[PDB]
Amino acid sequence: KLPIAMRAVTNYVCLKEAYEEQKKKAADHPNRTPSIWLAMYRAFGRPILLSSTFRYLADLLGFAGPLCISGIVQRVNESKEFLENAHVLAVLLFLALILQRTFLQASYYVTIETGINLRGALLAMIYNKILRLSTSNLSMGEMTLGQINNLVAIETNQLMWFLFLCPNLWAMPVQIIMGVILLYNLLGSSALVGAAVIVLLAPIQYFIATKLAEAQKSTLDYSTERLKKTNEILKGIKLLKLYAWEHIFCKSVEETRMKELSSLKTFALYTSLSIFMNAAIPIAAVLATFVTHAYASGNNLKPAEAFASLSLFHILVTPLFLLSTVVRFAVKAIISVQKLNEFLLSDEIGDVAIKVTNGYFSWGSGLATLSNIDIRIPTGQLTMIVGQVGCGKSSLLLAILGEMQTLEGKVYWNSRYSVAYAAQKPWLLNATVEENITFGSSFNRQRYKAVTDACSLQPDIDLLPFGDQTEIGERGINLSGGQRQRICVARALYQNTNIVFLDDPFSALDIHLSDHLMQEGILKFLQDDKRTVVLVTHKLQYLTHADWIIAMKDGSVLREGTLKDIQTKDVELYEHWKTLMNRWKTCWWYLTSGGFFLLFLMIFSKLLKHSVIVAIDYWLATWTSEYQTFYVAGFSILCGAGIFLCLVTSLTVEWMGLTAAKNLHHNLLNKIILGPIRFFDTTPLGLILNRFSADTNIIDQHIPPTLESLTRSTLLCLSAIGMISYATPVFLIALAPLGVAFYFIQKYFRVASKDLQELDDSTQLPLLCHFSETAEGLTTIRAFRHETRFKQRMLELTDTNNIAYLFLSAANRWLEVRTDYLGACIVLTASIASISGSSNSGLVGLGLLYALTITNYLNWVVRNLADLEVQMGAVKKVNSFLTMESENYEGTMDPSQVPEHWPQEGEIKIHDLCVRYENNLKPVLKHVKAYIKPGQKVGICGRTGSGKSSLSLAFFRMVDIFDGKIVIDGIDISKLPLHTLRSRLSIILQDPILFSGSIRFNLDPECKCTDDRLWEALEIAQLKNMVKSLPGGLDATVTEGGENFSVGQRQLFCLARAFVRKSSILIMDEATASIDMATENILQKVVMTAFADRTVVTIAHRVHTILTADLVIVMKRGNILEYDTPESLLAQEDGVFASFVRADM
Ligand SMILES: CC(C)CCC[C@@H](C)[C@H]1CC[C@H]2[C@@H]3CC=C4C[C@@H](OC(=O)CCC(=O)O)CC[C@]4(C)[C@H]3CC[C@]12C
Ligand SMILES: Nc1ncnc2c1ncn2[C@@H]1O[C@H](COP(=O)(O)OP(=O)(O)OP(=O)(O)O)[C@@H](O)[C@H]1O
Ligand SMILES: Nc1ncnc2c1ncn2[C@@H]1O[C@H](COP(=O)(O)OP(=O)(O)O)[C@@H](O)[C@H]1O
Ligand SMILES: [Mg+2]
Ligand SMILES: [Mg+2]
């Protein structure tokens, strides 16, 4: 598959051992900063040393040029008989050239091999780091999943590209100094002035690199922030669109984008300055050297000395072409390795089945979240943990798993055994349903079918495209919340471990599915296997089945024992429980984004600059043909104009790139957020966030440099061809054969590169997805103790990706070799033609010296052209989203028709409403009719899939209405603008979507609310005390996803977010699914006493809540069966609502 030397495992072992030695060295000194750079040096130096050796040989074979040009010019002008003959010299020059290119390609080969090995090793290192880092890093804002993915995607690759270019950073100094010494030999002391001019590049480039590094660090910071915001928007589109907050968040993202673009503009300015200095300092050096020689050495330059000197100046200039690129990549790689080294130095993890004694545990802050934890989990018996929101239940489970640092106490596990964890927030991989349920276990049809039947997944999976073999999770078909949770519980049940930790598996399930699970999946299956079970549920009706009961309050265990033991000891708690139970074209578009003034300005300026440079060389040739005021003046003005045009041409391309990036991202963002919700439901979030992150990174930072280098190289090559044709006209005859060869080699390689690039992309997306899915749900992987299998999967995937990239690099080597040999042929033919058929001795020198140049710059033209193609692909994709369908915000109803207080009364009339999500799909609602009075408390109930949530989203026109009316306060919502409808009605969704920032930001992003009303809403939502206790009060931070809070607390925050708006109609959709009964009862009482005037429709998770309601609706497959008061439905014999009440109680 891949040679043992290039397997990721061996390179990883080497790098890890070197890094561990560096860690020991750091431990010794107070510096205490293990350095990745030295570890990489020790591990992978010898390859780079070999590459440097090859490059140093190539440099001498390059200096071979000036000598032969001198000899040929001298002989055309006027033992060892073969040595001087011009044709013999030309043959020798061709041979030396091919050998130099061979050595150069050898160095490039060694460096690419080492870079790929090091990328594999580093990905392995940071992956093992992911498998070791503590979740308290992601929970407290120390880092994010986005940063962990950014490392893998951008920063490792940037370091790899830098390693590709690494040898230059010391080979170029050597070559420049050697050229200066030889120039001294030729030109006397006059060459030392030019030597000083050239030397001044080192201070200049160091300063420019300092500024570039500052700018790049700022750009990376702002890009991370911008992508954080964009990812949150893409994930929470549903809530943002329902609340009409889309544009506020879009504006915030645009502000961060403006800051990032300012940083990018500073970086572009200094990159343009570096290019300008690199190009100009040689022109100034030539001017100074030759003026000084004219005025110092009375003897004029004979043609031989002159053309040798000009050739040496070309040899000096050739390395300077790359210097800007290498400084760019070195600065970016320095920042990347700083990030990687920060990541790799972070926080890491430190009968009775499980007993905890005097356990104090904390979530990393250093303050105990649990205290005096004295518990025991009896072996082979069901334990049930019961408590109100935020009482340390999930915390207790994770503490037993050892996921949070222990301040005191011990845990005994009569090393940890594999425990089956079904986390409260279900986590699914990107494999099929069968792969999620089996989760690395031998398939057994009997057990698989039993578990699937227990979790009632069979009806759901046969409705999927390819039942039991459909790609689930991100990058595949999405599943409803209940489906995902039941799949996760099925995964937990199917494994053959002995301890099963189920953290609230009934949150999304309805009464029927929940009861079926509780009976068949747990009480029967797990007891038949005699497995220990620990349940964390608010379903107090199941306490009769429990064998051991743990009661938690305010982080500490209040009481523990059997039900009878609790009744005997703590009568209060048992009585409380009983009371609670009631017992291409894209390239042209990118270029045109400038507006036809910057594009044409750029092209014209670059043409003129290259013309002036070649004119400088021609003037030197003619001047030394003299063998004077006029010549010095002409030379000086030529050089000055060259410098000026260098400056202009340096600025133009970078400005074009800045503008293109800004416009592309702005269009993408604005069009994406306006799209219909169906688009986000259908398209995986990956296919959008990738556009926003990776393609945007390309368009911002990779296209402008590639384009500018491409233009420089191509214009140098064309200019050399023109100068040669002027020197020897017959060369135009030989131009056609070589051009044909060029076309054919490029044809073949371009198709090959397309194919291998497709392979590389297809092999890397699974690797990034693996890093993602392991970063998330880390606790699950470490609970099943499947870390070894995941390490193996990572190793094999990275080996596959490395094989793909190795083939791509081999194709690059093929084309580089072919084109370099074509250039060598060009040099040989041009030298012969100039020797035999040129008019003046000066012309042959110019022709030969530009023949030398074509070889180097043709390779760059080819390589940069291919890179520009692959990079324009992303512009093609980002622009593609500009084709999307956009939701109709216009609205037919006139603004004057809409009152100032539209939902003043709150009455709604639903007339023959029928709704479906996409055309040619099943109508989920069927001729539903409703009449809710103003100031009416309605309760809607039913089984999952009855269309309650469809009816809820109908009010906000998030579901397409085939036929019907929804008349709210006398206006058909279809006529109104979308935002006036979606802003004057409030809805509480079941799944809490909480953004990063303060409590204020989540409660009121617009900051249009006084703190008093925020406190009021928090008090209604039963969170006033917790927020008061928090360090910052209403300014306290919320991490991404609200992970620093409990799930129930997240839902309560989502309730406060709706209570603040204070509209007249409130659609609460199963909002108390994750909230416990104790909190839920008081919350409902307070909401009824507070919103008594408004109309509230509550899609209820438990019918006990809507037992007290003015009106009750029961849905069944989109049909309203019964429409009356709860008393009437209860008194109906064999009614549906009565059965619901019996089951729930
Ligand atoms: C002029 C001739 C003789 C050689 C042309 C290249 C060289 C001048 C070498 C010597 C000094 C080197 C530079 C000096 C140090 C840096 C800064 C370095 O980035 C940092 O030091 C981090 C930023 C910071 O210091 O805060 C990136 C490479 C770079 C530009 C080096 C690139 C290669 C340079 C320019
Ligand atoms: N990931 C976390 N990082 C840091 N602190 C946390 C984290 N999760 C919860 N906390 C803190 O732990 C305390 C206890 O919450 P815990 O996570 O144990 O909730 P829970 O009782 O299992 O939740 P619920 O019953 O509402 O589902 C909360 O006050 C919260 O501040
Ligand atoms: N995002 C969606 N796209 C298309 N169809 C959906 C979507 N969500 C649910 N449905 C379909 O609508 C029907 C009712 O779903 P839903 O409204 O979620 O019921 P509930 O009232 O239990 O939430 C189901 O049969 C399901 O197939
Ligand atoms: Mg919990
Ligand atoms: Mg629903």
Author numbering: 250 to 327, 341 to 612, 665 to 728, 744 to 912, 975 to 1018, 1028 to 1545
Manuscript excerpt for this entry:
Functional KATP channels are hetero-octamers composed of four Kir6 subunits and four SUR subunits. SUR subunits are not only targeted by inhibitors, such as insulin secretagogues, but also by activators, such as KATP openers. Here, we present cryo-EM structures of SUR2A and SUR2B subunits in complex with Mg-nucleotides and P1075 or levcromakalim, two chemically distinct KATP openers that are specific to SUR2.
We first solved the cryo-EM structure of SUR2B in the presence of Mg-ADP/Mg-ATP but without KATP openers to the resolution of 3.4 Å. The ABC transporter core of SUR2 shows an occluded state, which is similar to SUR1 in Mg-nucleotide-bound KATP structures. However, the density of TMD0 was missing due to its flexibility, suggesting that TMD0 was unstable without co-assembly with the Kir6 channel. For better visualization of the position of Lev, a fragment of TMD2 in front of Lev was omitted in (b); the residual detergent densities are also omitted. d Empty KATP opener-binding site in the cryo-EM map of the SUR2B subunit in complex with Mg-nucleotides is outlined by dashed lines. We observed that Mg-nucleotides are bound to both nucleotide-binding sites of SUR2. The dimerization of NBDs further drives the closure of TMD1 and TMD2 and the occlusion of TMD.
